[model samples]
Target: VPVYDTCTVPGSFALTFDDGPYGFSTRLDSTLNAANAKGSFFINGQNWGCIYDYADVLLERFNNGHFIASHTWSHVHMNQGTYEQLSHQLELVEQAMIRILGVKPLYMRPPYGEYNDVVLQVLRDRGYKGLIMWNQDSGDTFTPTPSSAQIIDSYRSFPEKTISLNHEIKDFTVDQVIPAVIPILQQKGFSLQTVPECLGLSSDPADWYVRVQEPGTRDDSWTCE
Candidate 1:
């Protein structure tokens, strides 16, 4: 049987961003700090090198309590690459993270949510247990000029247990979505958590990734309901 680890929490939301630290990280960090929200940022190591020259700023974010995870060394889709290529990419990113942050990340948000059993197996073997995806999108990745209305509408559409996808590269997202969404989420009774926290799992791999007892059963031990 193929055993899988599932999220433990049922009613919480996790806010995650990807492809970041270009010019908007300081603003995004300030907004999250102001909201008293902690989030996960899945970053491309190449972006840090190409745009910011290293992972120093990203390390600072991790030091400040934000969860930093891997997106890839480059923004390559996992399913599109050969096994050697995938290994190289993951290793490169892992090395960069360790070099800058002194710890390698155990969570990954694959580019475009592209993955397969092979990808999963590789990650599992490498001690990663969490794969993040969004239940809601702020559409910040699609627009250079995202509006408060679009951000609000996205939040309204998925009012509960939503993991909103935003990018830290866009000026509008840093300026607009952060201020617009945080207060509303707080008002609506949503408590912002990291991906691991929102899922009710420990950050340590030894304690993380609880398995569901049954394939389709809603066991209270592993699931919320």
Candidate 2:
């Protein structure tokens, strides 16, 4: 029904990254692992890179308990596409995730956080459980892109519970801002969680994904063409 822009649980912050399955994703993964925190990734099909190119790492992120969700096929603004285009945006990414990870995500973050009632209907028809938005924006993708310090400062203060927006594609955000802010949030007594967990949804990881088939074998055809 309603879109979610914040975590429902008190003292929980769901650190979410979008526009990835990118070059810096592995580094971002390790950073989260090193801090013993979890994150939710809202990945695209062909934005920064082809989804299949990063298959193993995407699978690993899921295996290690981070939430893997969709950010559409091409990062198109959700509110601007035709009904068929909207459906295709979601379907393409769904097929890719099913092929690579053997599961379909229940949650998605719309590109640019743009969506209206029209967009909402498409999301509903597509069977998404949540249209996740963010209360805290890292400004990592802001125009005249912010310095690492500026990004870090954005997270220095936030609500007790938040679903913060970030991008794993940013080297500084992945390499510096996340590490710096994680400790700050922890010190302030917040537990970093995946989106589903923060929303007071299923604790079972299986519930976050619908397995339709086994992971597909990688091949030359896996390229995003």
Candidate 3:
């Protein structure tokens, strides 16, 4: 139950940007660039629906020292979804990343922070190496988004080893939240890194992933088999 409220990463603070690869992601990356910060993105396969990043800006994403992981194909609630449904979300996200970027991520964050024992086991069976949950949320997803100063206040509150969650999909985040928060987080003696970095795992995708898919989609009954 503490997991609902806390996270534990041994040494470094991890700042994760979730639910995207669209809109202001590149823009946010620019802000991170200026600050010399590293952040992780938990991507949704269909978030941009292949209409954007079709030519593989993810290459630039990796080259910029940003890490990418799956946030599922769609933002589905896993608590009540069938095993098959959850598998489909994972598979589609994995396939899309592999096809479009030639990289397979080893982490996932269940949508809305929703998951259970079954959800965790299902992901492990399917080979995800990390289930990333956060110790603090930036609350950027609040309706109308928070005012710049307000969101910045939320981010300033932290412990020494923090894994904070923020969204990269909105103009509010790019325009207001990150700009203000980036400086504050850095000032607190937190050197930003991705989830894998926080976990003491190699940042290289190849270290945790096996490429070469079996190659096929399944009906709704998809499973680890």
Candidate 4:
């Protein structure tokens, strides 16, 4: 995991999935294991015990050498929310990570890649290492799924450095997209990395915990205020 971006490296890419710990997340883990690669899972706090209804999946990712990132608390669009709201969103995931894995992530990926300078500043001040975003996606999440040939073509082209996105909840992405992807990237000489390694950083931080700006201010983020 040599440093990236301050300088550039060829054939380096990141494979990241969002809004998961969903049904079949274990299978995604199996796929990565089979490919002998590591990827990142961006947990969505809103889905914690309701929509997702599982904690083991998240714990497994951490124990199994995969990287974890935040998708936000409840998948909110940060650009439309306040700074305090954004802080609360991040804090939610930080707390979750500590509880489940006993570590905090260094990266956050905005839901749907929606963010602005305000979101940037809020996270920066809160001590995030950096942001992660996708350079590509295929039709795996959409209807009928793309043809195998179509899926292959999509990842066949990549910029020298790419952070590609997919979802663990989507069956098509799992059954089809990843199978074609890992091989194609290998053929193209692109090596997959966890989001942190792509940035030339480590995933686990020693003093990992939520450090929100003002705990008293964000009443909505709490069950009691």
Candidate 5:
């Protein structure tokens, strides 16, 4: 019922990426799959690129056992949005996922990892089961972002159970950090998993994604414009 920044199950690790369905997303998805690991992707409808453009990528990730969740439509700070604006941000992504992936997400990562009372109220009204946060941050979006080695070094001392924050929009994160840290996490005895897997939730996608009546449209408005 509370915001989840850490994994509930001990000895589990979740690599949760936010702000994606971007240019590098497919690469990241494959990298994880090659290592026999799964990630939780908190996708944006329009951030690094339009979600429609990456519909196939989302489908592949979902089919490959990766977790597909929402990061709002345009990565707006949830605390700043009025209830209507917040609801709009969430709805558009839900619509996109329904159209593209055929399932509505049950979890979301608020942009900037921020939310207020209004944000919570809107998320609740929209049927989100959990507002996903992170225990460890890769700092991939920091100004003059850290190199992959530095990010990898940060994880060498990770707690037994962790939910890490990363972004699929960053090249170094997808190309370097993931491959490098995964082996390190393995050496440290962490079982890489999606957020829901670590949370002890149902592995069934049906539980995490409910079918909705509003079939989304893919017209001119699908673009980020």
Candidate 6:
């Protein structure tokens, strides 16, 4: 069993970064550490071997109080892949995490938010508890010049619990955007939490596949209040 700290207040937000453990991960780790902020990183196993050279840096982040989780072996969409392929992808990642970090991750954020019953069951057998998605997107992935002001403003427009999606693949994300977002979040009284913590859930299988019901039409409209 894993122990988690629950957020006692509303308007708390969780910051999650996907498709990473890349070269920029070290810098992002430093920035978050300096801010005294904690976040979750959903990494791709392909990136671990291809882009990051090794998983050492990722292990360091996990050791230093950041949550490390899977984003699949490749960034492939789970709904599109065959059941066997999906299982393989997840297993490869799980094996790597256990080998390198010494513990299998219990949280998974499917690529493109694509998952169905089969995908859910596959994760269940492997003991994943949370399937995290975001309430607010910083648009850092598509924007030519990532805007911290825009990201922070987009977050502020919503008046409830929020989970923000970001990418550590960009230089601006590490150097400019996150620094700006953190100060404003602090000033606005938003407590930061990891996925399991914010949802008041555990990594145990009994608590797996938990989803929140909130008032919203699209991703932008999700709110706890």
For lDDT, the strongest prediction is: 2
Mind sharing the TM-score for model 3?
Answer: 0.83
- Candidate 3 residue-wise lDDT at 200: 64
Put down candidate 1 lDDT per residue, 23-66, tens digits, no spaces. 77877888888777887788886653442253456656766678
Q: What are the per-residue Cα lDDT tens digits for candidate 2 across 11-47?
A: 8998999999888888889989988899999999999
Evaluate model 1: give its lDDT.
0.68
**Candidate 2 Cα deviation (angstroms), residue 75:** 0.7
Error of 6 at 166 (Å): 0.7
TM-score of each prediction: 0.81, 0.96, 0.83, 0.80, 0.93, 0.80
CA RMSD for every model? 10.9, 1.2, 5.4, 5.9, 2.0, 11.1
Model 1 alpha-carbon drift over 4 Å, by segment: 1-11, 48-54, 143-146, 203-225
Give me candidate 6's TM-score against the actual structure.
0.80
- Clashes in model 2: which pairs? none
Local error of candidate 3 at 99, Å?
Answer: 0.8
Compare candidates 2 and 6 on TM-score and give the better one: 2
TM-score: model 4 vs. ground truth: 0.80
Which residue pairs collide in model 4, if any?
A: 46-74
TM-score, prediction 5: 0.93
Candidate 4 residue lDDT tens string, 1-225: 111222134566777788787777778788888887788788787663332245567666766778777888788978999989999988877766655555566678888778788888888887786777766676566566677668668878765467777777777677777877888887768777776666655534232233333223212332311
lDDT of 4 at 185: 83
Number of the candidate with higher lDDT, 3 or 4: 3
lDDT, model 2 = 0.88
Candidate 6 per-residue lDDT, tens place, 102-201, comes to 4566778888877788788787776776677777777887637547667667766644466778887767777777777777786788766566656765
* Total backbone collisions for each predicted model: 0, 0, 0, 1, 0, 0
Q: Model 4 off-target regions past 4 Å?
A: 1-7, 48-52, 142-148, 203-225
Model 5: lowest-lDDT 10 consecutive positions:
213-222
Q: Is candidate 2 or candidate 4 better by lDDT?
A: 2
